[PDB]
Design a binder for this molecule. Structure first.
Ligand code: NA
Ligand code: NA
Lengths: 420, 210
């Protein structure tokens, strides 16, 4: 149940605890930062505030101000006039409290606190430059095919899913892109303190009994249309278990002359089915790259009810860091609030949560120990419009608070897939 | 600049499909060089006569959260009854709807207006899946109000006895509507979970003739 592994390597949860247990609080009013000390005895005599303003990860301005706060006291820091850019995006302010000097318990340059705020946002009004190229649709009995030069997109008309993508003669997918509504259960979803308890109230059990893990997709609609400058595929799927419809998924895929595939997803969830762990898509990619790079919350694993410690910026990590090696395997390594994701030739833009690794949700839920996991061929990608909270208040009864359960009934998310 | 914000057209294409016409639009509401909202829509008129409207709105994170995200128009028809599947029968709002029940409700048009002495937004009904008015039917998941008074006349007139019924019927269909609040009435009282702060919004509507 540790914040650390037996060898004292941090679990991702530790960083959330560090952030929430901060000894300095911050408010932002206009250009003023108010820093309040939660110490009771010490003045801030080994602390400096670093501030940084960035546009979608791009550093615009930064600075340093010494901290001189009495225990329980306040210091107002006035920011210099910020040299606003004209280009579209969201400006983010980040502050960090840094300890310049080593102590008996920390190294020089130790970070004790941080915080972020959204500053100005400039919405993108300027149209994209109209591409000259135009995609073409090749219909067969079994498939819709879209080609754009080297690029090729294949929609299986029997299943209703994007079954394959081609760059010239190279395959991009090892498994089709399908809706996913389940996760490999966390310890908080399993809910039991004792071994032989088959607790009928736990999330995994409610999910198992409703047939979430074994629901079969049934195709309702799979049509293709040609527009002036794009091809539009439209699909509708029903997930059923024992005649009962749990989820309906309605999708458009819009492929334009730029080679961008725009996916719209609208999901209905039956109000009497237990709230799903996630509402997303997954596929097994053929590529295995070294680095994952994203504009979103990071660097560490973060979930909707555990993301306060994560900062929004441009993060770049090795693939292996995008997996969390919990001894008992589960859904893991998610990052939330992501606007852009980069992996090998692929780029996904939108507002989504994702995890990426060499292990399928299936392998993760079938394996009892982490050392028994084996890297699957290619890379498993889950991209979620929505993900349920993880809970934790205890680990033997449902603990995901109401506001983090997927209860809306109707959900919408949109993704742009392109090959940069 | 929310009240004086002017719609600027970005896109307006038409496309013929196998069994439908697809109109795609984009707009930006600006005030003094600042982009407040972007609205992206598709209209799909198919062979059965139904028009499906899909709306996706962006709100700048640094503009005050808007009062509503919706559509309005003035219908030519003045009918006797309003029939809806949703929350009712009385006026209800996102942070004042626990008393309302989900059912099929049928009231005279006049009942769809609440005569507050100082006129304001009024008569909203939430959680509506189907709205019927004369030959018109709207389906989806929306909030609406319907009356002879425009949002403009309501905000310009100071007493209820000075209001005149306009020509036809003003319809407001909202995908999202701000809470009313009221913990007090001299400071912002709308709780955070009832402010339209998501940044991106989505609703869909089917309009047909029954
Ligand atoms: Na100091
Ligand atoms: Na008024």
């Amino acid at each position: 149940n540790g914040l650390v592994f037996a060898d004292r390597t941090p679990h991702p949860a530790l960083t959330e605890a560090k952030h929430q247990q901060q000894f300095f609080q911050f408010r932002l009013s206009g250009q003023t930062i108010e820093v309040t000390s939660e110490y009771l005895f010490r003045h801030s005599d080994n602390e400096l505030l670093h501030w940084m303003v960035a546009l979608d990860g791009k550093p615009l301005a930064s600075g340093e101000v010494p901290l001189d706060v009495a225990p329980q006291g306040k210091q107002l820091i006035e920011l210099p006039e910020l040299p606003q850019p004209e280009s579209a995006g969201q400006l983010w302010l980040t502050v960090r409290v840094v300890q310049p000097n080593a102590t008996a318990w920390s190294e020089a340059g130790h970070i004790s606190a941080w915080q972020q705020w959204r500053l100005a946002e400039n919405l993108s009004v300027t149209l994209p430059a109209a591409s000259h190229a135009i995609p073409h649709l090749t219909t067969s009995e079994m498939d819709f095919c879209i080609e754009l030069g080297n690029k090729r997109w294949q929609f299986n008309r029997q299943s209703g899913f994007l079954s394959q993508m081609w760059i010239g003669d190279k395959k991009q997918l090892l498994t089709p892109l399908r809706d996913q509504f389940t996760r490999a259960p966390l310890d908080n979803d399993i809910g039991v303190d004792e071994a032989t308890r088959i607790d009928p109230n736990a999330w995994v059990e409610r999910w198992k009994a409703a047939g979430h893990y074994q629901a079969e997709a049934a195709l309702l609609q799979c049509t293709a249309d040609t527009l002036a400058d794009a091809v539009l595929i439209t699909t509708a799927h029903a997930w059923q278990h024992q005649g009962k419809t749990l989820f309906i998924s309605r999708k458009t895929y819009r492929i334009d002359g730029s080679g961008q595939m725009a996916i719209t997803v609208d999901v209905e969830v039956a109000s009497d089915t237990p709230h799903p762990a996630r509402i997303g898509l997954n596929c097994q990619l053929a590529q295995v790259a070294e680095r994952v790079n994203w504009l979103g919350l990071g660097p560490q694993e973060n979930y909707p009810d555990r993301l306060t410690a994560a900062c929004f910026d441009r993060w770049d990590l090795p693939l292996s860091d995008m997996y969390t090696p919990y001894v008992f395997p589960s859904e893991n390594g998610l990052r939330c609030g992501t606007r852009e994701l980069n992996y090998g030739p692929h780029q996904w833009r939108g507002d989504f949560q994702f995890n990426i690794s060499r292990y399928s949700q299936q392998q993760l839920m079938e394996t009892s120990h982490r050392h028994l996991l084996h890297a699957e061929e290619g890379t498993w990608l889950n991209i979620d419009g929505f993900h349920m909270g993880i809970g934790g208040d205890d680990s033997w009864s449902p603990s995901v608070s109401a506001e983090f359960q997927l209860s809306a009934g109707r959900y919408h998310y949109q993704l742009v897939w392109c090959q940069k």
